[PDB]
Design a protein around this nucleic acid. Structure first.
Length: 121
RNA sequence: AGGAGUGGAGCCUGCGGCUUAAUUUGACUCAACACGGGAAACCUCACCCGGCCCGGACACGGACAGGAUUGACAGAUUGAUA
């Protein structure tokens, strides 16, 4: 029923992870942005380094790509598969670019659609 | 009974000794010594002098979105576009 951003993001990030995409970390996410292979950016909050977040806003703005501002980067690490080991490990991933469409070539779920619906307004 | 011999010469080969950084070593009566199919330039390769590589699965902990991987130049190689 309800598919708010904070629950469709997990679905879209996972579904991308099965089908490549998901450029994790500031490096290679900046590469996806400059190379213009990106379709969605997920910047995490509570990032101490101001230059980090400011530069990723700059990249997204100039490249005209949507930007999601989630909190608790560790949760982003869970979502993008950085955790592994059941539910242990958990490195922070405070930025991620969803290459080859917001969704992936495997499936086109409506959870992808809610993202663009929320971004249109 | 004899034939061809060889042991003598020079050379080719295997063995010991000597030598050497190293002259890798197995096998000393028949039943070791042109034997290991052993005619070694490299390779072979075991030996000697130098120098790269991990091709140290996997399990458990650290570190980690930057763990870690290549690398052009000049030095340097106390040999090399290592």
């Amino acid at each position: 029923g309800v598919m708010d951003v904070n629950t469709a993001l997990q679905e879209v990030l996972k579904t991308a992870l099965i089908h490549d995409g998901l450029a994790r970390g500031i490096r290679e996410a900046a590469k996806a942005l400059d190379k213009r292979q990106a379709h969605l950016c997920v910047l995490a909050s509570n990032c101490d380094e101001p230059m980090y977040v400011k530069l990723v806003e700059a990249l997204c703005a100039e490249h005209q790509i949507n930007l999601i501002k989630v909190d608790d980067n560790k949760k982003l690490g869970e979502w993008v598969g950085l955790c592994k080991i059941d539910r242990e490990g958990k490195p922070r991933k405070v930025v991620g670019c969803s290459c080859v469409v917001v969704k992936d070539y495997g499936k086109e779920s409506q959870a992808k659609d809610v993202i663009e619906e929320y971004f249109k307004c």
